[PDB]
Symmetry: D3
Amino acid sequence: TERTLVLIKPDGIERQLIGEIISRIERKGLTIAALQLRTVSAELASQHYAEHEGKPFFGSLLEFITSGPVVAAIVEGTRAIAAVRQLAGGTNPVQAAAPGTIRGDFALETQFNLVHGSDSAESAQREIALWFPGA
Amino acid sequence: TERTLVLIKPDGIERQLIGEIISRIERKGLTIAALQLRTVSAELASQHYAEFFGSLLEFITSGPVVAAIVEGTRAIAAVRQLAGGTNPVQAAAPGTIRGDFALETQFNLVHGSDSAESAQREIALWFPGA
Amino acid sequence: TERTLVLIKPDGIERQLIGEIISRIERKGLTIAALQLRTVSAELASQHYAEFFGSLLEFITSGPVVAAIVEGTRAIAAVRQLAGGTNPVQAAAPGTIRGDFALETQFNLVHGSDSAESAQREIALWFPGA
Amino acid sequence: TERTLVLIKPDGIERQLIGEIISRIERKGLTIAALQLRTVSAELASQHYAEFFGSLLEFITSGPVVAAIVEGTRAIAAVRQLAGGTNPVQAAAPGTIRGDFALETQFNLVHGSDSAESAQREIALWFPGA
Amino acid sequence: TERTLVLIKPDGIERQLIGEIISRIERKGLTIAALQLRTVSAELASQHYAEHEGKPFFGSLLEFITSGPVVAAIVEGTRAIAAVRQLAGGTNPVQAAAPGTIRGDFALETQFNLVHGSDSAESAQREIALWFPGA
Amino acid sequence: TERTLVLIKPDGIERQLIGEIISRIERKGLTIAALQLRTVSAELASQHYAEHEGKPFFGSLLEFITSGPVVAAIVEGTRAIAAVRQLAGGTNPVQAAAPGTIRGDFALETQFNLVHGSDSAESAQREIALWFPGA
């Protein structure tokens, strides 16, 4: 029984997919432990992507994530971390993600891949701390 | 352009309908202005339910709920439209949330403000700094 | 907590709606107590249809049907609710099985018992040892 | 067996509902006899809208529409059934196209001929050689 | 044109997926040749899993399959056997089954993978005999 | 931003999947630039399959494509060509196409795989010319 962080980015919201994404998580048999539509401080953004901070085009990541509010959620259940990455699909919506996955069905571009899921037990634990301090 | 309060009660959550209900709202053309899964204090429960009375509080507080501010043209009427009448079998038409998923008035899954006055008041309690 | 008889007639099957119809029942919160794809003897057909009369028997017996016992709170009313009025265009509302998929009264896909007395009798014929 | 004209207006297209609307028609048991995404000349727009008047033409011509001939038993009534009343919130029931997706009468996504006379005339304008 | 055995196990039923699973089969273009909700005798259970009888944790398989009634069905059509295994997904719902498949979309655990489909022409013929004697 | 040709063959229409297929394209984020239900001349058919003209069973391809009207469409958007082939699935609906794809979910036979999508920038440009002369 694991906990993982899930974000529905501003592009997932504008395209009216909040409900859709939650549904897919619920139906996989996972539970929404925490859920909140919120804004992202410039620092929370940099803290989230801190790992890719050095990398190229880092700045563009922060710009988008703060352009509108996001839906943050704690997803909980058996193999929650792997399962969510499964539902989401690979990073490139066309060359990687299979159809039937969130990105596979709805996305065309890596920048606008709608959703985020923690990639490891360590990442989840850290990301959950930033997004849900008192959890 | 109106704002209305929407609750997905503990029964809507256990039956895995959070996503479903939000989707229906989004597709009607409304926007989720605020959204939070939270617990309900005893006072908040009691004061929300002005209108057996006890079995309600034990219900609304038995688990966390999803509270939301829904915003858009005729948001109040539209949400009550999507939800259906109160009795899921004798009132709500199929195609509505209650019409499609509910059998009992107690467990009708969802709540929507019933008037401009109710919304304004309910939103205050559920989203103080809004 | 009631029990009602449900039939998915040969037209519902050919149009690939078995799954669809069961899903709608399950999601309303009802339970499939019994379920069987079977053929209909001439007597069973005739005796089911007490209420042109001949074209019916030739229909109900033209292929196998899916018989089911549906069980739950207000099961009888709920199923008739999901199904819709008899005339798919002039009576049944959209969102209902007939409302969404049917055009003709003859081919309205599905049957649900119309009363506590009817259910009890119909269940006896279709599921003798129940 | 009737023929009726159906339009998916520019608002239905921008909201990505072409597929959705066609699906609902197909599943009711109707057939798409003709189908074309096209632009609307000013005369065609004006003459279609015999029944603020100006904001309509600017709407129907603001982008291409999907025109279709829908054919089948009671096609005319059935399509108006699927579509819902004109005011998406006060008239159309949920389960209908307008009931599920629309909030405003101006942007009610879709059009269906309202009578045998209207269909025959509208089909002539939109599909001259039909 | 093949025939294959399909079971909707007690977990598929409790999770309200009978309709869902049948729908997916129908839409693939297959036909329900036989269909019945029934209980499973202790021996029918052992006869079904006879192959994995020796294997470890064999007993736990029999316990679950008999804990509630199942929906048995004969599915018929072109490549029915392969098609059904396709719709179902690999055995491990998270590490094997792709999303879009029954297990891929709804399951987290191998024990509770909701559904069964014959794995070969020989298996189908034998399994159909046990579950639908006069077929 | 690419343009690709899409056909909903006579089998996709008889099985009532026009709406379904368009929906999947729209939801991926692509736009229907052109759309028309039409009949296929014997020559248009041979012009379309001109590449496989020499190949065996060529004649059977022309027979089917002309047996009823088809829905032709120009699909437009980012990576439109790859995306559409993604949504469609591999050619053999059972051995290649994954579930979640059009062929994966609805087809059993290669002949009746419901749908067509241009396979390259060169193919699209040529196919669009034949199907939508004044485009």
